[PDB]
């Protein structure tokens, strides 16, 4: 008991997380390698606590002497939809404005089966997406059914169980290091760096996956470290 | 126990003369030298293992590559200068620089840089022994415009701290992974702006140690 790890941070939907984690606790490695994970993310050009050079004066790039903390600088941002599996990155798509169900269907049309083929996933491959209500809207459910897509069981409020959240941090690190100064550049750097992310990086994310399910069970469905 | 040089320099006599003749100079002297040189920055460095193409969405390096001294991305050629107090002008050279383009670059940028860097009245200009620098026209421009030129030993880039500054600019620009020459040029000017006086000053503060090593090594090649 004392020697067990006890969670300090609660998660909602702990019973659903236990149903997911216990039932997938003995799935084999091939199965996890053939899950196509997916999510959206937002990348800011000027990160809210990135100490960037803001102006040039007398030939020197300058950072401000005095700043007030903020949650959001100017400079704008890009929103992205992406997918990946253990074997590598799938499609990356810039999303414009708020995404609705019809727009989500169009994203899947284009990019889902092309990604699966490019990644050479096996015949029993499974698609993962989160529990946004748009994902079971009539038009989306019909597209998934008509295109024979198998959808992974999924608990709500569980980004610590989707390794794509690690992949986005890798993309952000690569993009940030190229020091973009405008949004056309931010877009092109996101696509270029996504294309460079190593297949072995992706593989290492998925290799670690069953340990996440072990920790969800140990923590009775509360928040994991991941 | 003494350090003994493993690599010879053909111009050890002149190097040893330079170090002897300058080894007593105060730090003020080195802070008032305006160092200068040109450098070429390749878009696709000859042994940079860059991704060359995309196929099936994946960026790819070739399965088999033969070494080369030069890839086909093109390059930018730059003239620059600096002193302990900071960067001077950075200028993109048009094609291949001849003596007239060199005089023109000096017009525009040399004394502007001395002004902006606030060098003392006895500032000195440094540049290497490229035959162009000794031409009737460059030598006459320097004399007419009252520029004092540092006496300079051949094959001695290890004694010009701007070669470190060029490597710093190249590191910064390469890390931004440019994919065309327009970007390469813009990144060079952006990154030059990020190189500050403290960096420049630390290079020059270390300079007497270079002269110490030239003397220890009897004019042969240093580590620098």
Author numbering:
A (entry chain B): 5 to 230
B (entry chain A): 7 to 230
Task: List sentences from the manuscript.
SB is a member of the widespread Tc1/mariner superfamily of DNA transposons that has been developed as a genome engineering tool in a broad range of organisms. The transposon (tnp) DNA includes terminal inverted repeats (TIRs) at its ends and encodes a transposase protein, the workhorse of transposition, that catalyses all DNA cleavage and joining reactions required for transposition. Tc1/mariner transposases contain an N-terminal bipartite PAIRED-like10 DNA-binding domain (DBD) consisting of two helix-turn-helix motifs, and a C-terminal catalytic domain with an RNaseH-like fold and a catalytic triad of three acidic residues (DDE)1 that execute DNA hydrolysis (in excision) and transesterification (in integration) in a two metal ion-dependent manner. The 39 kDa SB transposase (340 amino acids (aa)) features a similar domain composition to other Tc1/mariner transposases.
To provide structural insights into SB transposition, we crystallized the catalytic domain (aa 114–340; including most of the flexible inter-domain linker that spans aa 110–127) of the current most active SB transposase variant, SB100X, and solved its structure at 1.4 Å resolution. The core of the structure reveals a canonical RNaseH-fold, consisting of a central five-stranded β-sheet (β1–β5) surrounded by five α-helices (α1–α5). The catalytic residues (D153, D244 and E279) are assembled in close proximity establishing an active site conformation similar to the one observed in the crystal structure of the homologous Mos1 transposase PEC (grey in Figs 1a,b). In addition to the core RNaseH domain, most of the inter-domain linker (aa 117–127) and also the flexible clamp loop (aa 159–190), which is inserted between β1 and β2 of the RNaseH-fold7 and includes part of the glycine-rich strip (aa 183–190), are visible in the structure. In the Mos1 PEC, the clamp loop is extended and interacts with the similarly extended linker and both tnp ends across the dimer interface, playing an important role in PEC assembly. In turn, in our SB100X catalytic domain crystals, the clamp loop is curved, mostly pivoting on three consecutive G-s (aa 188–190, marked with red arrow in Fig. 1a) in the glycine-rich strip, and contributes to an extended protein–protein interface (2,350 Å2 surface area; ΔG=−27.2 kcal mol−1)29 between symmetry related molecules in neighbouring asymmetric units. The clamp loops of both protomers form reciprocal interactions with the RNaseH core of the partner molecule, covering the active sites. In addition, the tip of the clamp loop contains two short antiparallel β-strands (aa 169–171 and 174–176), which form a β-hairpin and interact with the main chain of the inter-domain linker (aa 119–122) of the partner molecule. However, as the observed arrangement of the catalytic domains is too compact to allow DNA to access the active sites, it does not appear compatible with PEC assembly.
